[PDB]
Ligand binder design. Structure first.
Ligand SMILES: N#CCc1ccc(Nc2nccc(Nc3cc(C4CC4)[nH]n3)n2)cc1
Length: 320
């Protein structure tokens, strides 16, 4: 156990932080945290501290993403310029080194969040409403556009990596950048082929055809993953979920259902009850080339048409 409840840690910018109670479930070593003060760190703490040994690969990858793309002023400038209500990218508050029993450990200070969507999804009998799925997806498209414009792809979008704002249950954030991928370092897109440094293939039921083909993740892959998430949230199932131990089967089902999206709609939704925006979204992502920049605004309009169809609008209400 890396820290004590009430321990004061100092980051590389000489900012002092006070450690609170551990909240890391089973997953990484995470404690509640706040700015150093006379008062103890409470249950309402606005930060978390993530700790791993200095030699940990994913913490270095995650730290590099947050340092490069998630500086508080970087996010706020984007929110302002793009005229967004918020941006679901967690803010980076500091990082440092800590020693315990001779060994060296790396820590990161980040935003504290509420519940993950997987818990809420399971509590709602493995279903999310059309309104909830469209509102979630509009915000995920904002997150994905931002990280893609900052040379990164997530490659592992799912309900367990989507956490609600502790103070606002209508604001969803995308977490876990330990296996995030820098697809175009210095504006140079990675060629269609395997990356020897990368070992991860995402989460089998949601991962992209590109990842299944052993190719490094790109922008179209992240949008494809979101597509599968949308179907799973709307129906409580995916056609290939009964054979997840066999990646060959999962890739085969994905390749065949990409070739015929109408058969995917017929399989997942009751006859003539399929949401048109889901099919239109899948058809648009299908048209993307490996190195192609997505037309994010066009994908947003597709989802906005779905909200208009159900007599709603983008009011930012997640209704879950
Ligand atoms: N344990 C566990 C699962 C889990 C593991 C890692 C992350 N990563 C991550 N990245 C950036 C910010 C942030 N904030 C949190 C995390 C938690 C609780 C303790 C889960 N609260 N606030 N978390 C989120 C959930």
């Amino acid at each position: 156990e890396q820290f004590a409840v009430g321990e004061i840690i100092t980051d590389m910018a000489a900012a002092a932080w006070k450690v609170g109670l551990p909240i890391g479930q089973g997953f990484g070593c995470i404690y509640l945290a706040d700015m150093n003060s006379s008062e103890s760190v409470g249950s309402d703490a606005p930060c978390v501290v993530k700790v791993e040994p200095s030699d940990n690969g994913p913490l270095f990858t995650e730290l590099k993403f947050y340092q490069r793309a998630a500086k508080p002023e970087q996010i706020q400038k984007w929110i302002r310029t793009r005229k967004l209500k918020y941006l679901g990218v967690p803010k980076y508050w500091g990082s440092g080194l800590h020693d315990k029993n001779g060994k060296s450990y790396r820590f990161m200070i980040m935003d504290r969040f509420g519940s993950d969507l997987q818990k809420i999804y399971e509590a709602n009998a493995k279903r999310f409403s059309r309104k909830t799925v469209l509102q979630l997806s509009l915000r995920i498209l904002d997150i994905l556009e931002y990280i893609h414009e900052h040379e990164y792809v997530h490659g592992d979008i799912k309900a367990s990596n989507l956490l609600l704002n502790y103070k606002n249950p209508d604001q969803v954030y995308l977490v876990d950048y330990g296996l995030a991928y820098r697809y175009c370092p210095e504006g140079v897109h990675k060629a269609y082929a395997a990356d020897p440094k990368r070992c991860h293939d995402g989460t089998i039921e949601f991962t992209s055809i590109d990842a299944h083909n052993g190719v490094a993740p790109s922008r179209r892959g992240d949008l494809e993953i979101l597509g599968y998430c949308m179907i799973q949230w709307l129906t409580g199932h995916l056609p290939w979920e009964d054979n997840l131990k066999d990646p060959k089967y999962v890739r085969d089902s994905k390749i065949r259902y990409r070739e015929n999206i109408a058969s995917l709609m017929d399989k997942c939704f009751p006859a003539a009850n399929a949401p048109g925006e889901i099919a239109k979204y899948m058809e648009t992502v299908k048209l993307l080339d490996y190195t192609e920049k997505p037309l994010y605004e066009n994908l947003r309009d597709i989802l906005l048409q779905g909200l208009k169809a159900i007599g709603s609008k983008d009011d930012g209400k997640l209704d879950l």
